[PDB]
């Protein structure tokens, strides 16, 4: 077996505890190269003459090129030394340890996890483990208060087509009025984009981190929404824009005024004075040359404590969490501390990060709890919407992302389809509703936290920013209530099947020819199998289903009963159909 392709490290996403006494270990190797993987272990100070405990590493999944093996280690001592025993497709065995590969357990060495401190067990909020979040872009959801509209507000019609500077009147009062709709739908949390004082319609260019923007309301109205939402089982997550401030932020303006006499010049990255008010900025900003968004020096204690107080104040209004905008561009020390402050102020406040590349650095358990799953979106787009990838590539991409981080994080990844930064999924699907629904059926049953973008639930469409930010369709006859009900039902299933919210994932079938993909979620003795006929034609499959995990399943969407004959289940699905099979346990 190609030894150069065998990986593992006693830390990170390959070694970590899931309790003060249990260590999870994962190992990867070239696909099909290793057939069996066992973990021989013991206490670090245990005598050489003592008996080595065993542990069988299960084949947790396999992507395009790798096989992932996973096993659990019981460590009452909270200290452990372990070595792997890999067997090839032809009896060939070999030990794998910190020293290297040897046919003699001794010469291979033995990996070590020095100690499992209880304060380092990756822990995330319990409510966020089984949530369905709804993303609200305030300016475009509901105008409940006509009196606070910006000047030049355009019509709130379905044929409306926003500009980079348009305003429609969306406010917090509108949200509050819509809580019945949100509750009917079944969402358990609402993610808001920035809602703090700022001149734009997106408000990511913060003018005052301590005041709800005037066109959105006031502290009372906000407090009111938080309460009205809570009594309906709906939590509130706000968008923290800590990487940069808007050029209206008091501190920036003071610099713009007093130049390098400013008590706040080191709160930013100023290269020379005076500070530019042109198209050529002489201060660091978000992205490239974006005058309105100067970068905050979060490394500066002065700036850190301020932003931290901004956190305290909103946390004092009762919000349940944060989504950290452009988080990968602010220092780790800030986030570790931000975590200690947040989590001490409220143990159940969820911290979600927005990173557009491997986020394993912020997902060890001492910073964020999860992040936006842009990976889930790229896989879903290319599989369901554009048809650029088949069931087997889909399976792979899905699995590679699964192994990226520790389970605590993976379990809570915000699985989105689109955002206020992309074309609307239904549009990615070229208006094809059939394909659209299958993606939702998948999103609502897959591993992670499903995130619904306002309007998708009733059929809205649109190109990227700003056409994806159209005013919400509220007139019932202009809404696809058929879809609404579809969402509602799936949302009820997810809440009802513990498997769907707390189980693990395992591929079940993937025919690249038929383009049929299926997986199975499992928690304790419950099993739920999702079959997806992602093709425009009627098709028939035979899925391998040993009767140890049940010989009978029930299609949760239709109520049809299916049975296994000699360990094989034969299904027939209509074009673009998907069945959600519960094993009754
Ligand atoms: O004024 C700027 C901008 O501010 C706000 O944007 C915030 C946004 O809403 C938050 O979500 C977050 O953004 C993060 C984003 O969500 C992540 O996906 C990621 O972004 C990456 C992109 O995904 C990736 O595509 C790539 O981006 C490249 C583009 O693909 C490429 O086309 C090009 O983009 C240019 C645009 O085409 C062009 O229109 C122009 O952009 C203007 C916007 O059109 C306009 O709406 C506005 O945008 C606001 C926005 O509305 C606010 O919500 O002004 C823009 C110019 O000022 O110019 C673009 C390039 O100059 O090039 C990009 C660059 O590669 O990479 C990115 C980054 O990896 O990360 C984002 C940051 O975390 O935060 C922002 C800011 O707070
Ligand atoms: Ca308004």
UniProtKB/Swiss-Prot annotation:
Binds 1 Ca(2+) ion per subunit. It catalyses: Hydrolysis of pullulan to panose (6-alpha-D-glucosylmaltose). It is an enzyme of class 3 (hydrolase). Signal peptide: none annotated. The record marks 421 as: Transition state stabilizer. Keywords: Calcium, Carbohydrate metabolism, Glycosidase, Hydrolase, Metal-binding. One of its GO terms (biological process) is carbohydrate metabolic process. It holds the Pfam family Alpha-amylase. Ca(2+) binds at residues 143, 145, 148-149, 169, 171. Its cofactor is Ca(2+). The active site is at 325 (nucleophile), 354 (proton donor). Substrate binds at residues 244, 323, 420-421, 465, 469. InterPro entries: Glyco_hydro_13_cat_dom (IPR006047), Glyco_hydro_13_lg-like_dom (IPR004185), Glyco_hydro_b (IPR013780), Glycoside_hydrolase_SF (IPR017853), Ig-like_fold (IPR013783), Ig_E-set (IPR014756), Malt_amylase-like_C (IPR032091), O16G_dom_2 (IPR045857). Its EC number is 3.2.1.135. Belongs to the glycosyl hydrolase 13 family. PANTHER family: ALPHA-AMYLASE FAMILY MEMBER (PTHR10357), MALTODEXTRIN GLUCOSIDASE (PTHR10357:SF210). Hydrolyzes pullulan efficiently but only a small amount of starch. Endohydrolysis of 1,4-alpha-glucosidic linkages in pullulan to form panose. Also cleaves (1-6)-alpha-glucosidic linkages to form maltotriose. This is Neopullulanase 2. It comes from Thermoactinomyces vulgaris. The lineage of its organism: Bacteria, Bacillati, Bacillota, Bacilli, Bacillales.
């Amino acid at each position: 077996m190609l030894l150069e392709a065998i990986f593992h490290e006693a830390k990170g996403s390959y070694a970590y505890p899931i309790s003060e006494t249990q260590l999870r270990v994962r190992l990867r190797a070239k696909k099909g190269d290793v057939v069996r993987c066992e973990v021989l272990y013991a206490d670090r100070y245990a005598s050489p003459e003592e008996e080595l405990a065993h542990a069988l590493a299960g084949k947790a999944g396999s992507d395009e090129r790798f096989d992932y093996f996973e096993a659990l280690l019981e460590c009452s001592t909270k200290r452990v030394k372990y070595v792997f025993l890999l067997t090839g497709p032809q009896g060939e065995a070999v030990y794998f340890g910190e020293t290297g590969f040897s046919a003699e357990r001794s010469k291979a060495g033995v990996f070590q996890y020095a100690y499992i401190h209880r304060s380092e067990v990756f822990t995330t909020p319990e409510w966020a483990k089984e949530a369905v979040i709804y993303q609200i872009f305030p300016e475009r959801f509901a105008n409940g208060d006509p009196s606070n509209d910006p000047p030049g507000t355009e019509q709130w019609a379905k044929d409306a087509r926003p500009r980079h500077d348009s305003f429609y009147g969306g406010d917090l009062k509108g949200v509050i009025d819509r809580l019945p709709y949100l509750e009917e739908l079944g969402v358990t949390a609402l993610y808001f984009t920035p809602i703090f004082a700022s001149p734009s319609h997106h408000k990511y260019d913060t003018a005052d981190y301590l005041a709800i923007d005037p066109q959105f309301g006031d502290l009372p109205t906000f407090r009111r929404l938080v309460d009205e939402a809570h009594r309906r089982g709906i939590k509130i997550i706000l968008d923290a824009v800590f990487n940069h401030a808007g050029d209206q932020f008091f501190a920036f303006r003071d610099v713009l005024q007093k130049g390098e006499q400013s008590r706040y010049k080191d709160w930013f990255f100023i290269e020379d004075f005076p500070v530019s008010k042109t198209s050529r900025t002489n201060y660091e900003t978000f992205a490239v040359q974006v005058p309105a968004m100067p970068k905050l020096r979060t490394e500066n204690p002065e700036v850190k404590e301020y932003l931290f107080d901004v956190a305290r104040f909103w946390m004092e209004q009762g919000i349940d969490g944060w989504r950290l905008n452009v988080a990968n561009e602010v220092d780790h020390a800030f986030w570790r501390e931000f975590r200690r402050l947040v989590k001490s102020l409220n143990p159940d406040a969820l911290i979600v990060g927005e990173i557009w590349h491997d986020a394993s650095g912020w997902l060890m358990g001492d910073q964020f709890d999860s992040v936006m799953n842009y990976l889930f979106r790229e896989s879903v787009i290319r599989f369901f919407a554009t048809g650029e990838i088949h069931a087997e590539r889909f399976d792979a991409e899905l699995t590679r992302a699964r192994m990226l981080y520790p389970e605590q994080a993976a379990q809570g990844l915000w699985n989105l389809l689109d955002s206020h930064n992309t074309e609307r999924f239904l549009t990615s699907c070229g208006g094809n509703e059939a394909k659209f629904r299958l993606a939702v059926l998948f999103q609502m049953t897959y591993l992670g936290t499903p995130l619904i973008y306002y309007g998708d639930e009733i059929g809205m469409a649109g190109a990227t920013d700003p056409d994806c930010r159209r005013p919400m369709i509220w007139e019932e006859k202009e809404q696809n209530r058929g879809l609404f009900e579809f969402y509602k039902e799936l949302i009820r299933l997810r809440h009802r099947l513990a498997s769907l919210t707390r189980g693990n994932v395992r591929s079940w079938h993937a025919d690249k020819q038929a383009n049929l993909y299926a997986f199975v979620r499992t928690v304790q003795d419950q099993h739920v199998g999702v079959v997806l006929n992602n093709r425009g034609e009627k098709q028939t499959v035979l899925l391998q289903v040993p009767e140890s995990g049940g010989k009978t399943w029930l299609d949760c969407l239709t109520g049809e009963e299916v049975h296994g004959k000699q360990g094989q289940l034969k299904l027939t699905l209509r074009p673009y159909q998907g069945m959600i099979l519960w094993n009754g346990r």
